[PDB]
Amino acid sequence: GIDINHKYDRKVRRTEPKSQDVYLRLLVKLYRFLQRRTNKKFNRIILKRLFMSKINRPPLSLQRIARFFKAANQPESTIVVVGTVTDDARLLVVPKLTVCALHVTQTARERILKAGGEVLTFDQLALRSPTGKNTLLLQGRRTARTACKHFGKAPGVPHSHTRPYVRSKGRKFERARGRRSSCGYKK
């Protein structure tokens, strides 16, 4: 007709997960109700974080929680993490806190009940603060996974820095011609 139905007319990002649960749908079939009456941006970022895969809905270890709870002058804010706040040991003292979280491991409840601060889930949260007043939102790292440093190689630069696919460590493994000095060239 014209010419543009060009590209992309195609809003890529996910509408609903490829997952056929009856618990995770129950959050979606609840939290679609609580972002289309209010317009609060805090609910939508809950909704758009109910959708990533197992990886990239980041794992999140407990020492990252604590100094964020020591991001001080907030003694009442409730912790919301869409992920897995597991347990790490070397945080010796543990503070009183109350988290909303998807998945909490058995060794993770056992120290925060030893804290002892009650952890709550999302429908458990949903009774309390749908506005999000005094609520914290913590999302883990995504260069965190070690399998995610294979990017993006063209070695001539000294901005190369990017972990080739090894067979296994030792010697005579991708270390003679190209890397070091004397076998042809330094990268």
Partner 1 sequence: GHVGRFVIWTESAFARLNDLFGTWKKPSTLKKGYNLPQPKMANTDLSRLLKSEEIRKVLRDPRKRVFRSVRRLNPLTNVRQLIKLNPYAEVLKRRAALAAEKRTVAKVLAKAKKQNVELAKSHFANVATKAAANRAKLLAARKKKVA
Partner 2 sequence: MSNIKRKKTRKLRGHVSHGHGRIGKHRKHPGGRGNAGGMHHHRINFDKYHPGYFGKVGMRNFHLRRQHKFRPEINLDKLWSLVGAEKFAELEKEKSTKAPVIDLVKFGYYKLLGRGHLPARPVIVKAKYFSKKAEDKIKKAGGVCLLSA
Instruction: Look at residue 47 and give the partner it binds from RNA, partner 2, partner 1, none, a contact being a CB closer than 5 to 8 Å depending on partner kind.
Output: none
Q: Work out whether 37 is an interface residue with RNA (CB under 7 A).
A: yes
Query: Residue 107 — φ and ψ, nearest 5°?
Result: -80, -5
Site for RNA in 127-156 (CB under 7 A): 132-137, 146-148, 150-152
Least distance from RNA to the Cβ atom of residue 123, Å: 13
Least distance from RNA to the Cβ atom of residue 17, Å: 5
How many CB atoms are closer than 10 A to CB 57?
21
Q: Whats the size of the chain, residue-wise?
A: 187
Question: x/- contact string, 164-183, with partner 2 (CB under 8 A)?
Answer: xx-----xxxxxxxxxx--x
Nearest alpha carbon to residue 100 among 116, 76, 124: 124
Q: Structure tokens of 18?
A: 């490829």
User: Which residue blocks in 18-88 are alpha helix, DSSP H?
Assistant: 24-31, 41-47, 62-69
Q: Work out whether 36 is an interface residue with partner 2 (CB under 8 A).
A: no
* Nearer to partner 2 among residue 89 and residue 127 (C-beta): 89
**Residue 20 and residue 71: Cα distance in Å, rounded?**
38
Q: Structure tokens of 185?
A: 């060239």
- Selected binder of RNA within 47, 66, 94, 115 (CB under 7 A): 66
Q: Work out whether 21 is an interface residue with RNA (CB under 7 A).
A: yes
Q: How many residues line the site for RNA (CB under 7 A)?
A: 70
